[PDB]
């Protein structure tokens, strides 16, 4: 066939019921995630090709970067609660990996302050129980699907994208193959 289990995707031997339709995992410590977001814009191009009616969830993971990794997952919870993903994603990636100016929670906070979220808004969200449940969700979803590596994308709790089985000679072509696969998986 043209799309084959084990080729552009893999199937979970233990399917995850009630999972978000298109589910993406990342970490601001993850070098390929940096590529996926700032060079390739994967999440964005996947969207562009998803059918109507399908929502995409993106979650941060704990297993990279120790203490700051967990901080970063809570701040991503804050980002989601406040709806400011599109304003902090890039400065967080560049803070962790480019300039290396993120070394503590406080530095994570500075990014939000600079992106225009108010101190009192940030701190309240940071400490809110809404954010604690939203942290819990991020952790649960990672747990449900065995998650040991990022970037990772799961469709309908049953399929897992396998980008290593796609040509990388051309970056535009890789993205579109990626996006088309998610589309195919979605329709399955």
> What number of other Cβ atoms are within 10 A of residue 97's Cβ?
16
Judged on CB neighbours under 10 Å (0-12, 13-18, 19+), 119 is exposed
**Burial per residue of 25-64, b for 16 or more beta-carbon CB atoms within 10 angstroms, e otherwise:** bbbbbbeebbebbeebebbebbeeebeeebebbbbbbbeb
Q: Which domain holds residue 62?
A: 1-188
Which residues, including other chains, have CB under 8 Å from residue 26's CB and lie 6 or more apart?
Answer: 33, 36, 37, 58, 59, 60, 61, 150, 151
Angstrom distance (rounded) from CA 21 to CA 163? 19
Domain count, the chain: 1
Q: What is the CA radius of gyration of the chain?
A: 17
Edge-to-edge strand ranges of the sheet holding 159-161: 9-11, 159-161, 152-155, 22-26, 56-60
| CATH code of the domain containing 101 | 3.40.30.10
Dihedral angle sign, alpha carbons of residues 54, 30, 113, 119: positive
Contact between 61 and 28 under an 8 Å Cβ cutoff? The reply is no
C-alpha pair distances (Å), 159 with each of 7, 71, 72, 105: 12, 29, 27, 34
> What number of other Cβ atoms are within 10 A of residue 187's Cβ?
10
Omega of the bond leading into 55 within 30 degrees of 0 (cis):
no
For residue 68 the two structure tokens come to 């700051």
Angstrom distance (rounded) from CA 101 to CA 163? 30
Please give the method by which this entry was determined.
X-ray
């Amino acid at each position: 066939a043209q799309y084959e289990d084990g080729k552009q995707y893999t199937t979970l031997e233990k399917p995850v019921a009630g999972a978000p339709q298109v589910l993406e995992f990342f970490s601001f410590f993850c070098p390929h995630c940096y590529q996926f977001e700032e060079v390739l814009h994967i999440s964005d191009n996947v969207k562009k090709k998803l059918p109507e009616g399908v929502k995409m969830t993106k979650y941060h993971v704990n297993f990279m970067g120790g203490d700051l990794g967990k901080d970063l997952t809570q701040a991503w919870a804050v980002a989601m609660a406040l709806g400011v993903e599109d304003k902090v994603t890039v400065p967080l990636f560049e803070g962790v990996q480019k300039t290396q100016t993120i070394r503590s929670a406080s530095d994570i906070r500075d990014v939000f302050i600079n992106a225009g979220i108010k101190g009192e808004e940030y701190d309240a969200a940071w400490n809110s129980f809404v954010v604690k449940s939203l942290v819990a969700q991020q952790e649960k979803a990672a747990a449900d699907v065995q998650l040991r590596g990022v970037p990772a994308m799961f469709v309908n709790g049953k399929y897992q994208l396998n980008p290593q089985g796609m040509d990388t000679s051309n970056m535009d072509v890789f993205v579109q193959q990626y996006a088309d696969t998610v589309k195919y998986l979605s329709e399955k």
